[PDB]
Amino acid sequence: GSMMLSLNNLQNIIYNPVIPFVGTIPDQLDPGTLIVIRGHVPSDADRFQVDLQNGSSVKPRADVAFHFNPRFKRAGCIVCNTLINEKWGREEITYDTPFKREKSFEIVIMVLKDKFQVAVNGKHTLLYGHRIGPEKIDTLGIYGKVNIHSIGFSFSSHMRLPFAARLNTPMGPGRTVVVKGEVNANAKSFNVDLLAGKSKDIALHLNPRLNIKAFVRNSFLQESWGEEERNITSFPFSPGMYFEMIIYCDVREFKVAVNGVHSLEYKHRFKELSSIDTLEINGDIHLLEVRSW
């Protein structure tokens, strides 16, 4: 189905680099970091490569954690490998290659904990397991017959609070909103609200109060708070704790789950679901990510 993703990135972008290019990565490649390379294959090209390197020495040649090497002779392919102490390890070749001479491309390399995940032109292309710890990578190299228009790095970052957004599509049965974050180590309470944007009514007010371990829910209708609902089996939050809160819109009620566990249900008071079109989030957390489908 269709889904929305919302987040903050620190971005570091290099326009029009000259090839061959040897550049220092602006920061460490922690899991979740993207590298985005945009370019074009010249008509006369046989190959080019992108190398994630440990330094830029040439003699002895810098270790290459990730050598990503599209080739064009024959039917084409992408060669991948790692160079350690001037020795190439075992070679991993992918034959479903999207690269073509005289065609533009976008490479997206996601740096995961255990591997690199690479997509070209919006479609998945290959995985590549780490052989060198990714934390040892501080240099990017691009060599061969290729034009590069930009090289971009994307680093994850905490979203600014208070957070306030219109959803692209309103609530309704089967709609789902996910809030990913981290409770402050110093935290007292935080709030997640679903509003009717126009009337400023709050259909669902989610309010974990860590100081007293109470998960409070309410609605703000006709310009006044209603009866609070606090009934809970256990309090699923703690300071310093990562959390995934899922809010599912059912016909009769919202259902909320914290970390994969169903935590509470809340009967709809504001029943025009398709008028619930705004999300607000604030308080003592680090907001990491918001998803809705």
């Binding site: 889904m3 259902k255 970390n259 994969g260 566990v261």
Partner: peptide, 9 residues
């Protein structure tokens, strides 16, 4: 998508 803990729903 991107859920360490799954989804009950």
């Amino acid at each position: 998508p991107g859920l360490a803990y799954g989804n009950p729903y």
